[PDB]
Amino acid sequence: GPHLLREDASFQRYGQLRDNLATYWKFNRKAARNVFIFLVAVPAGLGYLAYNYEGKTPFVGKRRTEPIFEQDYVPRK
Amino acid sequence: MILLCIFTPFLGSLISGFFGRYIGVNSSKWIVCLSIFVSVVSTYILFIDVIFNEIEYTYNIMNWLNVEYLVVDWSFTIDKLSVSMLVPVVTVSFLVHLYSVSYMSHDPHQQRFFSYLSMFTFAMIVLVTGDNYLILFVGWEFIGVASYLLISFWFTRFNAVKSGLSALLINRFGDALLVLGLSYLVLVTGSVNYNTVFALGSYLDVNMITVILICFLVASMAKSAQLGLHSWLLLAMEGPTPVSSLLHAACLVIAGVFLLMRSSPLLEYTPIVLLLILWLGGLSTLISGLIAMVSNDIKKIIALSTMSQVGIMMIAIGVSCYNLALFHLICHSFFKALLFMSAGSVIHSIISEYQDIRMYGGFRQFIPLAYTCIFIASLSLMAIPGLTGFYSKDIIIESMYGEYTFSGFIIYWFALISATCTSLYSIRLIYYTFLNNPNSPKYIYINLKENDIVLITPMIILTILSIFGGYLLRDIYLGMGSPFNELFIHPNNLSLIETEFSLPSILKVLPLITGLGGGLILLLIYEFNYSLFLVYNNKNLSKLYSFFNQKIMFDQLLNNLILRSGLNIGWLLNVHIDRGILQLFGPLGLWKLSTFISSKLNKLVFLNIGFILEIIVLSWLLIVFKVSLLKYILLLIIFIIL
Amino acid sequence: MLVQNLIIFNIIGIVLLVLLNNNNNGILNKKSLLTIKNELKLKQIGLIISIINILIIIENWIGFNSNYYGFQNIERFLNIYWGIDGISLLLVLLTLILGPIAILSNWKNLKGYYTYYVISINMLVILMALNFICLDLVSFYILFESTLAPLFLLIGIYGANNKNKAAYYVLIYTLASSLFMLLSIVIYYIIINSTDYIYINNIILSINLQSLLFIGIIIGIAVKTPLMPVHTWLPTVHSESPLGGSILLAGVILKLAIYGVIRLLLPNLSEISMMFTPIIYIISILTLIYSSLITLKQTDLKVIIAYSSISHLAVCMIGIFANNLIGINGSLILCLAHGFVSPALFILVGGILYDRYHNRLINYYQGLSTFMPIFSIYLVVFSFCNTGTPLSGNFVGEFLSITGAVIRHPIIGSLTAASVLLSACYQMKLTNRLTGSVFSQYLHITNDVTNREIFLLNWLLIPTIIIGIYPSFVTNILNLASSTLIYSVLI
Amino acid sequence: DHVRSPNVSFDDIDYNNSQDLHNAQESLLREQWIRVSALKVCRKALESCYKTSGPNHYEDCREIAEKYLNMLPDHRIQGFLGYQKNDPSK
Amino acid sequence: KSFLPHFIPKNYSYGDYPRLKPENLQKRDPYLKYDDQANKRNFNEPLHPQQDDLDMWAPDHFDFVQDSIALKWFGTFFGVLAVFSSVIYIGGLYPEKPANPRNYPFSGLAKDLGASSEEDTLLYAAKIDKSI
Ligand SMILES: CCCCCCCCCCCCCCCCCC(=O)OC[C@H](COP(=O)(O)OCCN)OC(=O)CCCCCCCCCCCCCCCCC
Ligand SMILES: CCCCCCCCCCCC(=O)OC[C@H](COP(=O)(O)OCC[N+](C)(C)C)OC(=O)CCCCCCCCCCC
Ligand SMILES: CCCCCCCCCCCC(=O)OC[C@H](COP(=O)(O)OCC[N+](C)(C)C)OC(=O)CCCCCCCCCCC
Incomplete structure (x- = not known):
C-alpha cells in the first residue's frame, strides 16, 4: 500500500548474496576439509562412542559397594 | 499461610503488568510493594513456626508429570532450609521495592x-x-527470564540490550547442564522428589552421584558467577541500581549456593566434587578481590565484591560446612544490598549522575547519611568484630585452616588474601568517593544534597540489620548440635571442633591485622604519597594494572576466541554444508548434471536415415555378444556421454 | 461414523464452493455479489467448513475409551479399514484445529482467488487428518503423498518471489524419497499378502530383510521430519510458501514423520529398530546441533523460524526412538506443543511484519517494542516457549524426550541436553535484536497487532500453556497406546 | 464398572487366533502397569518414612529403601513385543 | 591499535558482488552523524558479505591488547598459582592434623548410617571409635 519500508539497495544486495551463496561455492581443498570434518570425522567420533557404550551402561538404581571414607588416619610424621 | 507467602508477589506482578495503565504510576508501585509486604509478614510468621516450633508446611496443588514411574507434582514445602532462604529473599525484595519507589521516580516506565x-x-x-x-527448575529458569528483562530494561541502550542477552545465554548454559543432571536423577532413582532422592544418597554409586552433581556444579557457577561463567555478572550493572541491589544480595547470584546446599545429602557421598567446589570458590575469591582494587566504576567494585563473597560461601560448601555457607549467605544479603542502595544514593545525589569514582571526592560532609551507610556496610563486609559479617565470614576463613588438608590450607591463603583485598578496595572506594580531594566541578558541590526519606528508609533498616543481625542468628546456624537435618553433614566431615579449638591464636586475628593494618597503609599512601600510584610511569605496573583492570582478560578471551569461533562454525556449516556440499548433492548439482545429459540427448534426436539405421544394426551385436559383456557395454556407453 | 462423515461433508463442501463461485464464469463480464469484499461470503463458508470438521472428531472423542487396548472406532470405507487409538486421536485434533487458523491467517492478504485457496487448505487438512486414521501401509502412503498435489499448486500460485523454486523442491524432495518408502510397502504386500497394521506387527522377518525395509521407510521419514542432510528443501519452502501453507507444513506435515515411525517402524520392525537406534541418535544429534549453529548465520526472518523447527523435530525423533515410555510420551507431547508455537512464530514473522513491510531481511528491523508493544509481548512470550522455558508444552516435551534419551543411551543421549542452550542462542538473538535498541530507521510507524492477529496468537498460546502446566490431559490418552511400542525382554 | 484384566499367556495360545493374541498382549501390558502402581506405593512409604524419621531415615527406612532400589530396574513398562516375538526357552 | 576479529577473510569472489575492505562498525567514531546513528551506518552504504560479524549486534571486540599477549598473561596468572600450589604440596609444608580425626561409638555409627549387619559395617560406618 504505502511502502512503509524504505528499501535499501545495499541491504538488498547483501540479502541476495546470502540467499545465493550456493552459486559461487567451489569444492576446493578448503571446502573438502570442512566437508570431511562435519560429515565424516565428527559422525565417526559419535559413531564410535555410540556403539562402544551401547548396552554397557546399567545405571538404573546402581548400587554402591565400596566404602567412600578412610577408616584409619596415617600421619605424615 | 504458605499459599499467601508464595503467590502474593505474583499478584502484584499481574496487577502492575496488566492493570498498571488503568491505575497510574504511583498506585502501581505501592500495590506491588503491598503484595511483597504481605509475603514478608507471612514469611516471618512461618519462620517462627518452622525454625522454633519444628513444624513443616506442605501444599500440593495438583500433579504435573505422571509418566509411568516418573511422578512430579505442583507441590511446595517450607522446611528449615526453605524458610531460611525466604527471609533474605522476601525482606530484601521488599526493601528494594521500597527503595525503587523513589529511585525510579523519574523513569517513564515505572x-x-x-x-x-x-x-x-x-x-x-x-x-x-x-x-x-x-519445581526448582521452574523458578531457576524464570529467574533468568526476569533478570534478562531487568538488565535490558532500558532497551533503547545498546549496551543494556546486549548485556541482558549475555546474562541469559550464560545462565542457559547452566540450565542445559541442570536439565542433564535431572535426567540422570530420573535414570538412577526414578524420581526428582527431595523426600525420595535424599533417602537413597548412601546407597547410590559414587560415579552416578558425581555425574549428577557435576551438572549441578556447572549450573551453580553460571548463576553464582564463579570462575569461567562470571563475565555476565559485571554486565548486569547496565540495569537500574534497584535491580543490582536485588540481584546481587538475595537473588540469582545466590541461587547456585542454594542448589548445592539443597543437594547436601547427595553431595556428602562424592568428595571429589567437594574438592572441585573448594578450589573453584577459592580461585574466584582471589581473582575477584584483585580486580576490584583497580576498578573505577562504583557499581563494578561492589559487583566484584559480591563475586568475592559468594566464593567464600562456596569454599564453606567445599568443606561440607553447609551451615556456615547458609549463615554467611543470610548475613551477606543484608549489608551487600545496603552497599548497592547507598551507591545508588551517591549517583542520584550528584547532579551529573557520574558513576566513576575518579570523578568523585570530598562527598563526606555533603552527604553524611549516605557515607555512614557505606561506612557501616563496609565494616560489616570487612568482618570487623562485633558486626554481622564478622560472625558469618570470619568463621569460614578459619574453617579452611581447620580442615587440615592440602586443599584447605591453599584455599586459606586465597581466602586470607581475599579478606585482605576486601578491606583494601573498601578503603580505596571510600577514599575516592568521600575523602579524596574534589574532582568534580564546583557547581556539583553547591547542588549536592541527600535524597528523600523514602530512599533513606530501607537503608536505615538494612543498616541496623547489618550491625545486630549476625549476633542474634549465630546460634541458629552456627551453634554446635543445632538440629538442621535439611542440611546433611556426614560424621566424618564435622570439623567445627578442630576449627574452633585447635587454631593458633595468631590465625584468629591475622585477617584483622592484614585488613585494618593493610587498609591504613593504603590510606596513608593515597593521602600523602600519591605519586607512588602514578602507575603509568612503570611499564610492569602499567601491564599489571591493565591486566587486572581488564578482568584477567577473560572477557576478551571469551568473546574474541570462544564466541567468535562458535559463530564461525555456524558460518562454516552454512557455507560449506548447507549452501555447499548439500547443493552439489542437491538441486544445483543435479541441474548441472541434467543440463549436461539432456544436451547430449537433444543432439541424438534428428531425422536421418543413416543415423537410425546404424543404431538398429548396432543393436544386433547384443544378440551376438555373450551376455557377460553387458556391463562392459554399459561402461562404454557412459564413456561416450562424456 | 467418522471417516465417512468427514469425507462426504468435505466433498459436499468442495462442491458447494465450486458451484457458487464458478456459476457466472461464462464470459458474463458480470459483477455478482459473492465476490464482493474479496469474496467474503466464500471465505466465510470455507471457514465454517473447517470448524465443523473439528466437531466431527469431537463426537467420536466422547466415545473414546482410554482404558481400551487396540484401535477403536473401526470402520470400513472405500474398501479401507479406519481406526483410532490414543496416539491417532490427539494428532487428528491438532490437524483439524489448525484448519481455521490457517484460513484466518490469509483472510485479507492474498492477491485473489480466495476460493481456490480455501478449498486447497481444507483439502490438505482433511487429507493429513485421514492419514492418522488409516489402518494399512498402502492407505498410509496414499494419504502421505496425496497432499503433494494441492500443496504444489498452492505454493506455486500464492507463493513469494521464489515460489517456482520452492514448488519444485517440495514436489521432488518429498516424492523421490517417499518412493523408497513405497518399495518397502510393496515388499510387505509381496511376502505377507497384506499391509494391515495389526497383521504385519505380528510377523518377524529376517534380520537382513528388516534392514532393507527399515532403510527404505526411513528415507521417506527422514526427508519429511526433516533430518540432516536431506533438510535443505524445508527452509526454501517456508520462506516462499504462503502463511497458511507454512502453518500446515510446520504444524502437521512434519509431524507425519514422527507418526510414521510409530506405525511403520516400531511395531513391525522392532528388532531392527533397536539396532538402528544408535545411528538414528547420531543423525538426530548432529541435526540438532548443526541446525542451531546454522540458524545463527541466517538473515531471512522466515528462514530462521524454518531452521528452528528442524532442531525441535530432531528432539522429537530422538525421543520417539527411545525404547522407554518417558521418551515416547515426551516426543508426542513435543509434537503437539510444536504444532502451536511454530505456526505462531511464522504468524509473527510472515504474517504481521511481512504483511506491513513486505521485506523478510533482518537488517530492516530493530526496536519494534517502541511502536508495536502488543507485537513484542507475543514475540517474547512465544520466543521463550520455543526455547523450552517451563510452563510451556515445549518444555514438557523436551525434558521428557531428553530424559528418555538418557535412559535409552546415557552416554550419547546426554548430548540432547545441548538443545536447552543452542535453542536459546538463535531464538533469543533474533528476539533480542527485534526488541532492543532504537526503532528502525528503515520503517514507518504503522498499525500494531490487529484484532484478527490477536485472535490467532492467543488461541495458539492457550493450548501451549495448558499442556505445559497440566500435560496429564495428553498423557492419560497416550499411556496405553504408547506402551505397546516398547520392545524389551527382561529376564 | 472396574473391568479386570483377561489373564492370558502367549505360551498357551495360537497367534493365528487374533482375539487370543489380542488378549495376551493386553494382559501382559496390564500386569506391567500394576508393577508401576506398586512401585509408586512403595515409594510413598519411603517418602513418608524419610520425613518422620529425620536423622533416623537411614535406620528406620533401610528395608524400604533397599526394596525400592531392587524393584526400580524392572518395575516399569516393558511392552509385549519383546516376549511375544521371543521364546526364552530357546 | 584496532585489529579485525578472527575468521574475517582477506579476500572473496562472490561473482559481481562489490569487494570492499572489511570494516568493524563497532570501531567507528560515535561523534559523527549517521542516517542510522545506533548502528553507525549511512543509508545505501555497502555491506561486507560477513557484515553480521562486523556490526553492533556482533559480539563486542576487545582490542586493547593482542589475543596472544592476552592469553600469555592469562596463562601466566594461573601459572603462578600452579607453581605456588605444587611447591607447598611437594615440599609438604602444610600443617599436620593436630589430633586424630573424630571417632564415633557403636561401631562408628554403622547401624545409624544405613548398615544392616556386620557384613556391611565397613561399607557405611564412619571412623570407628576403637577406644570404646
Ligand atoms: C495466556 C493464555 C491463557 C493461559 C493462562 C492460564 C493458564 C492456566 C493453566 C491451567 C491448566 C489447567 C490445570 C487445572 C485443570 C484441573 C486439573 C485437574 O484435573 O484436577 C486435578 C486435581 C486433583 O485431581 P483429581 O482428584 O483427579 O480431580 C479431578 C476431578 N475431575 O484437582 C485440583 O486440585 C484442581 C486444582 C486447580 C488449580 C487451579 C490452577 C492454579 C494455577 C496453576 C497451578 C500450577 C502450579 C503453579 C504454577 C506457577 C509456577 C510455580
Ligand atoms: C477430497 C477429494 C477432492 C477432489 C476434487 C476436488 C475439486 C476438483 C476441482 C474441480 C472444480 C474446479 O476446477 O473448480 C475450480 C475451483 C474454484 O476456484 P475459483 O477461484 O472459484 O476458480 C476460479 C474462477 N474465478 C476466478 C472466476 C473465481 O478451484 C479448484 O480447482 C479447487 C480444487 C482443486 C484443488 C487441487 C487441484 C489439484 C487436484 C489433484 C488431485 C490429486
Ligand atoms: C533419497 C532422498 C532424495 C531427496 C530428493 C533428491 C534431490 C531432489 C532435488 C530437487 C530438484 C528440484 O527441485 O528440481 C528443480 C531444479 C531447479 O533448480 P533450481 O533450484 O531452480 O536451481 C537450479 C537452476 N539454476 C541454475 C538456473 C539456478 O532442477 C533440477 O535440479 C533438475 C534435476 C532434478 C532431478 C531430481 C531427481 C532425483 C532422483 C532421486 C534421488 C537420487
Whole structure:
C-alpha cells in the first residue's frame, strides 16, 4: 500500500548474496576439509562412542559397594 | 499461610503488568510493594513456626508429570532450609521495592519495572519452596527470564540490550547442564522428589552421584558467577541500581549456593566434587578481590565484591560446612544490598549522575547519611568484630585452616588474601568517593544534597540489620548440635571442633591485622604519597594494572576466541554444508548434471536415415555378444556421454 | 461414523464452493455479489467448513475409551479399514484445529482467488487428518503423498518471489524419497499378502530383510521430519510458501514423520529398530546441533523460524526412538506443543511484519517494542516457549524426550541436553535484536497487532500453556497406546 | 464398572487366533502397569518414612529403601513385543 | 591499535558482488552523524558479505591488547598459582592434623548410617571409635 519500508539497495544486495551463496561455492581443498570434518570425522567420533557404550551402561538404581571414607588416619610424621 | 507467602508477589506482578495503565504510576508501585509486604509478614510468621516450633508446611496443588514411574507434582514445602532462604529473599525484595519507589521516580516506565521486579521475587520464591527439583527448575529458569528483562530494561541502550542477552545465554548454559543432571536423577532413582532422592544418597554409586552433581556444579557457577561463567555478572550493572541491589544480595547470584546446599545429602557421598567446589570458590575469591582494587566504576567494585563473597560461601560448601555457607549467605544479603542502595544514593545525589569514582571526592560532609551507610556496610563486609559479617565470614576463613588438608590450607591463603583485598578496595572506594580531594566541578558541590526519606528508609533498616543481625542468628546456624537435618553433614566431615579449638591464636586475628593494618597503609599512601600510584610511569605496573583492570582478560578471551569461533562454525556449516556440499548433492548439482545429459540427448534426436539405421544394426551385436559383456557395454556407453 | 462423515461433508463442501463461485464464469463480464469484499461470503463458508470438521472428531472423542487396548472406532470405507487409538486421536485434533487458523491467517492478504485457496487448505487438512486414521501401509502412503498435489499448486500460485523454486523442491524432495518408502510397502504386500497394521506387527522377518525395509521407510521419514542432510528443501519452502501453507507444513506435515515411525517402524520392525537406534541418535544429534549453529548465520526472518523447527523435530525423533515410555510420551507431547508455537512464530514473522513491510531481511528491523508493544509481548512470550522455558508444552516435551534419551543411551543421549542452550542462542538473538535498541530507521510507524492477529496468537498460546502446566490431559490418552511400542525382554 | 484384566499367556495360545493374541498382549501390558502402581506405593512409604524419621531415615527406612532400589530396574513398562516375538526357552 | 576479529577473510569472489575492505562498525567514531546513528551506518552504504560479524549486534571486540599477549598473561596468572600450589604440596609444608580425626561409638555409627549387619559395617560406618 504505502511502502512503509524504505528499501535499501545495499541491504538488498547483501540479502541476495546470502540467499545465493550456493552459486559461487567451489569444492576446493578448503571446502573438502570442512566437508570431511562435519560429515565424516565428527559422525565417526559419535559413531564410535555410540556403539562402544551401547548396552554397557546399567545405571538404573546402581548400587554402591565400596566404602567412600578412610577408616584409619596415617600421619605424615 | 504458605499459599499467601508464595503467590502474593505474583499478584502484584499481574496487577502492575496488566492493570498498571488503568491505575497510574504511583498506585502501581505501592500495590506491588503491598503484595511483597504481605509475603514478608507471612514469611516471618512461618519462620517462627518452622525454625522454633519444628513444624513443616506442605501444599500440593495438583500433579504435573505422571509418566509411568516418573511422578512430579505442583507441590511446595517450607522446611528449615526453605524458610531460611525466604527471609533474605522476601525482606530484601521488599526493601528494594521500597527503595525503587523513589529511585525510579523519574523513569517513564515505572509500571513495567515493578512488574518485572516483583516477577523476579515470585520466581525466586518458587525456586526455594518447591519440594522437588523440577519445581526448582521452574523458578531457576524464570529467574533468568526476569533478570534478562531487568538488565535490558532500558532497551533503547545498546549496551543494556546486549548485556541482558549475555546474562541469559550464560545462565542457559547452566540450565542445559541442570536439565542433564535431572535426567540422570530420573535414570538412577526414578524420581526428582527431595523426600525420595535424599533417602537413597548412601546407597547410590559414587560415579552416578558425581555425574549428577557435576551438572549441578556447572549450573551453580553460571548463576553464582564463579570462575569461567562470571563475565555476565559485571554486565548486569547496565540495569537500574534497584535491580543490582536485588540481584546481587538475595537473588540469582545466590541461587547456585542454594542448589548445592539443597543437594547436601547427595553431595556428602562424592568428595571429589567437594574438592572441585573448594578450589573453584577459592580461585574466584582471589581473582575477584584483585580486580576490584583497580576498578573505577562504583557499581563494578561492589559487583566484584559480591563475586568475592559468594566464593567464600562456596569454599564453606567445599568443606561440607553447609551451615556456615547458609549463615554467611543470610548475613551477606543484608549489608551487600545496603552497599548497592547507598551507591545508588551517591549517583542520584550528584547532579551529573557520574558513576566513576575518579570523578568523585570530598562527598563526606555533603552527604553524611549516605557515607555512614557505606561506612557501616563496609565494616560489616570487612568482618570487623562485633558486626554481622564478622560472625558469618570470619568463621569460614578459619574453617579452611581447620580442615587440615592440602586443599584447605591453599584455599586459606586465597581466602586470607581475599579478606585482605576486601578491606583494601573498601578503603580505596571510600577514599575516592568521600575523602579524596574534589574532582568534580564546583557547581556539583553547591547542588549536592541527600535524597528523600523514602530512599533513606530501607537503608536505615538494612543498616541496623547489618550491625545486630549476625549476633542474634549465630546460634541458629552456627551453634554446635543445632538440629538442621535439611542440611546433611556426614560424621566424618564435622570439623567445627578442630576449627574452633585447635587454631593458633595468631590465625584468629591475622585477617584483622592484614585488613585494618593493610587498609591504613593504603590510606596513608593515597593521602600523602600519591605519586607512588602514578602507575603509568612503570611499564610492569602499567601491564599489571591493565591486566587486572581488564578482568584477567577473560572477557576478551571469551568473546574474541570462544564466541567468535562458535559463530564461525555456524558460518562454516552454512557455507560449506548447507549452501555447499548439500547443493552439489542437491538441486544445483543435479541441474548441472541434467543440463549436461539432456544436451547430449537433444543432439541424438534428428531425422536421418543413416543415423537410425546404424543404431538398429548396432543393436544386433547384443544378440551376438555373450551376455557377460553387458556391463562392459554399459561402461562404454557412459564413456561416450562424456 | 467418522471417516465417512468427514469425507462426504468435505466433498459436499468442495462442491458447494465450486458451484457458487464458478456459476457466472461464462464470459458474463458480470459483477455478482459473492465476490464482493474479496469474496467474503466464500471465505466465510470455507471457514465454517473447517470448524465443523473439528466437531466431527469431537463426537467420536466422547466415545473414546482410554482404558481400551487396540484401535477403536473401526470402520470400513472405500474398501479401507479406519481406526483410532490414543496416539491417532490427539494428532487428528491438532490437524483439524489448525484448519481455521490457517484460513484466518490469509483472510485479507492474498492477491485473489480466495476460493481456490480455501478449498486447497481444507483439502490438505482433511487429507493429513485421514492419514492418522488409516489402518494399512498402502492407505498410509496414499494419504502421505496425496497432499503433494494441492500443496504444489498452492505454493506455486500464492507463493513469494521464489515460489517456482520452492514448488519444485517440495514436489521432488518429498516424492523421490517417499518412493523408497513405497518399495518397502510393496515388499510387505509381496511376502505377507497384506499391509494391515495389526497383521504385519505380528510377523518377524529376517534380520537382513528388516534392514532393507527399515532403510527404505526411513528415507521417506527422514526427508519429511526433516533430518540432516536431506533438510535443505524445508527452509526454501517456508520462506516462499504462503502463511497458511507454512502453518500446515510446520504444524502437521512434519509431524507425519514422527507418526510414521510409530506405525511403520516400531511395531513391525522392532528388532531392527533397536539396532538402528544408535545411528538414528547420531543423525538426530548432529541435526540438532548443526541446525542451531546454522540458524545463527541466517538473515531471512522466515528462514530462521524454518531452521528452528528442524532442531525441535530432531528432539522429537530422538525421543520417539527411545525404547522407554518417558521418551515416547515426551516426543508426542513435543509434537503437539510444536504444532502451536511454530505456526505462531511464522504468524509473527510472515504474517504481521511481512504483511506491513513486505521485506523478510533482518537488517530492516530493530526496536519494534517502541511502536508495536502488543507485537513484542507475543514475540517474547512465544520466543521463550520455543526455547523450552517451563510452563510451556515445549518444555514438557523436551525434558521428557531428553530424559528418555538418557535412559535409552546415557552416554550419547546426554548430548540432547545441548538443545536447552543452542535453542536459546538463535531464538533469543533474533528476539533480542527485534526488541532492543532504537526503532528502525528503515520503517514507518504503522498499525500494531490487529484484532484478527490477536485472535490467532492467543488461541495458539492457550493450548501451549495448558499442556505445559497440566500435560496429564495428553498423557492419560497416550499411556496405553504408547506402551505397546516398547520392545524389551527382561529376564 | 472396574473391568479386570483377561489373564492370558502367549505360551498357551495360537497367534493365528487374533482375539487370543489380542488378549495376551493386553494382559501382559496390564500386569506391567500394576508393577508401576506398586512401585509408586512403595515409594510413598519411603517418602513418608524419610520425613518422620529425620536423622533416623537411614535406620528406620533401610528395608524400604533397599526394596525400592531392587524393584526400580524392572518395575516399569516393558511392552509385549519383546516376549511375544521371543521364546526364552530357546 | 584496532585489529579485525578472527575468521574475517582477506579476500572473496562472490561473482559481481562489490569487494570492499572489511570494516568493524563497532570501531567507528560515535561523534559523527549517521542516517542510522545506533548502528553507525549511512543509508545505501555497502555491506561486507560477513557484515553480521562486523556490526553492533556482533559480539563486542576487545582490542586493547593482542589475543596472544592476552592469553600469555592469562596463562601466566594461573601459572603462578600452579607453581605456588605444587611447591607447598611437594615440599609438604602444610600443617599436620593436630589430633586424630573424630571417632564415633557403636561401631562408628554403622547401624545409624544405613548398615544392616556386620557384613556391611565397613561399607557405611564412619571412623570407628576403637577406644570404646
Ligand atoms: C495466556 C493464555 C491463557 C493461559 C493462562 C492460564 C493458564 C492456566 C493453566 C491451567 C491448566 C489447567 C490445570 C487445572 C485443570 C484441573 C486439573 C485437574 O484435573 O484436577 C486435578 C486435581 C486433583 O485431581 P483429581 O482428584 O483427579 O480431580 C479431578 C476431578 N475431575 O484437582 C485440583 O486440585 C484442581 C486444582 C486447580 C488449580 C487451579 C490452577 C492454579 C494455577 C496453576 C497451578 C500450577 C502450579 C503453579 C504454577 C506457577 C509456577 C510455580
Ligand atoms: C477430497 C477429494 C477432492 C477432489 C476434487 C476436488 C475439486 C476438483 C476441482 C474441480 C472444480 C474446479 O476446477 O473448480 C475450480 C475451483 C474454484 O476456484 P475459483 O477461484 O472459484 O476458480 C476460479 C474462477 N474465478 C476466478 C472466476 C473465481 O478451484 C479448484 O480447482 C479447487 C480444487 C482443486 C484443488 C487441487 C487441484 C489439484 C487436484 C489433484 C488431485 C490429486
Ligand atoms: C533419497 C532422498 C532424495 C531427496 C530428493 C533428491 C534431490 C531432489 C532435488 C530437487 C530438484 C528440484 O527441485 O528440481 C528443480 C531444479 C531447479 O533448480 P533450481 O533450484 O531452480 O536451481 C537450479 C537452476 N539454476 C541454475 C538456473 C539456478 O532442477 C533440477 O535440479 C533438475 C534435476 C532434478 C532431478 C531430481 C531427481 C532425483 C532422483 C532421486 C534421488 C537420487
